[PDB]
Design a protein around this ligand. Structure first.
Ligand SMILES: NC1=N[C@@]2(CO1)c1cc(-c3cccnc3F)ccc1Oc1c(F)cc(C3=CCOCC3)cc12
Length: 370
């Protein structure tokens, strides 16, 4: 899938985007790739932050659905007008599909000042689409209307410019080393998974594993940080604090309230512990683990921010997790694959890892239910 490699760009902390076209003749837009939502929505008015926007008046293939959509989320809001049009991905499969497009006509804290994207591609499932699950997500339309296989994979490589690959309809083996290990998609809404054990430098946090997935754990390309439920974050910080105690930092730093700095080239990587998440495996009583480095959870702003934070919406495996791995969203088999990314950032002492099998009992009890 050579044509799709390196089809993602971005700025640190502002997400990864892919070039798309909408309408006839095609209008080119850069679109944020978001596995944590399910709408395709694009700027359609001259907001001052935008390089460009969708001009429905210029598209002969535009169809109005004559319905509005209103989308508040935890950190912002957009609203718009529903329609369909022809959509393609220039550095994707050689196909063109008729997709739902929300033309964004009002927004708050959605667009980012200085960013180079103009819309959002929600790759999650219809259950969390707005206004409801009748609005078919883009990927659902793509698979229904073409022979593109029902899967995609992401290699996120990490203002400094970031890069990556979105392989639509397949897997590119040059993007990872070792084997893929798969964890089940628990339910098709978000890309929900189940974490069955957590270790900091190989030391089990020893919490009831339900806490790790309260109220859910998801794989989310549209979140920068690793977000952990409050109780788990407390416990994880406590352990990370202890493991790194040879150098002392202010309390606010652990809350993301301030940075920490060292002289260029002397960041003490080795004093910071690795973080391991064991995920439910494909087989009964079988798990595997993924392990990330401080290179993943200490974000450049040599100064750095702590990129793990507390959550009230469950665990979010954001860019901090994903930049460690090649991640396969195997929708066809209701599973997510992880393999060590060929592009992840590390040092000569430690590298991100995907390892298994491990023996883990009562993994079904780790899932949260109402
Ligand atoms: N993953 C996720 N995507 C969000 C929030 O988190 C998001 C992230 C970004 C962003 C910002 C910075 C860096 N990287 C990003 F992806 C930008 C804009 C943005 O917009 C929306 C949005 F409009 C709706 C929703 C939802 C709609 C319906 O229910 C599910 C949530 C989520 C998001």
């Amino acid at each position: 899938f050579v044509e799709m490699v390196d089809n993602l760009r971005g700025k640190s902390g502002q997400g990864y985007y892919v070039e798309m076209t909408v309408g006839s003749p095609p209008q080119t837009l850069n679109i944020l790739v978001d596995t944590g939502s399910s709408n395709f929505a694009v700027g359609a008015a001259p907001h001052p932050f935008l390089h460009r926007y969708y001009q429905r008046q210029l598209s002969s293939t535009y169809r109005d659905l004559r319905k509005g959509v209103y989308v508040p989320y935890t950190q912002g809001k957009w609203e718009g007008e529903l329609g369909t049009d022809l959509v393609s991905i220039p550095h994707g499969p050689n196909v063109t599909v008729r997709a739902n497009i929300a033309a964004i006509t009002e927004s708050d804290k959605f667009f980012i000042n200085g960013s180079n994207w103009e819309g959002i591609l929600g790759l999650a499932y219809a259950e969390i689409a707005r206004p409801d699950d009748s609005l078919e997500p883009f990927f659902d339309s793509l698979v229904k209307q073409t022979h593109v296989p029902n899967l995609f994979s992401l290699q996120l490589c990490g203002l400094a410019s970031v890069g990556g690959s979105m392989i639509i309809g397949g897997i590119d083996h040059s993007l990872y080393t070792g084997s893929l290990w798969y964890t089940p998609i628990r339910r098709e809404w978000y890309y929900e998974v189940i974490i069955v054990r957590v270790e900091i430098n190989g030391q089990d946090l020893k919490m009831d594993c339900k806490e790790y997935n309260y109220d859910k754990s998801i794989v989310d390309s549209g979140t920068t940080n690793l977000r952990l439920p409050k109780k788990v974050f407390e416990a994880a910080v406590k352990s990370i604090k202890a493991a790194s105690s040879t150098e002392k930092f202010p309390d606010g730093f652990w809350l993301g309230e301030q940075l920490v700095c060292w002289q260029a080239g002397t960041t003490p990587w080795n004093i910071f512990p690795v973080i391991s998440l064991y995920l439910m495996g494909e087989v009964t009583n079988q798990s595997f683990r993924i392990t990330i480095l401080p290179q993943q959870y200490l974000r450049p702003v040599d100064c750095y921010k702590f990129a793990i934070s507390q959550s009230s919406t469950g665990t979010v495996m954001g860019a901090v997790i994903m930049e460690g791995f090649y991640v396969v969203f195997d929708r066809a088999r209701k599973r997510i694959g992880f393999a060590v990314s060929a592009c992840h950032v590390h040092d000569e002492f430690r590298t991100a890892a995907v390892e298994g099998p491990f023996v883990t009992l009562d993994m079904e009890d780790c899932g949260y239910n109402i």
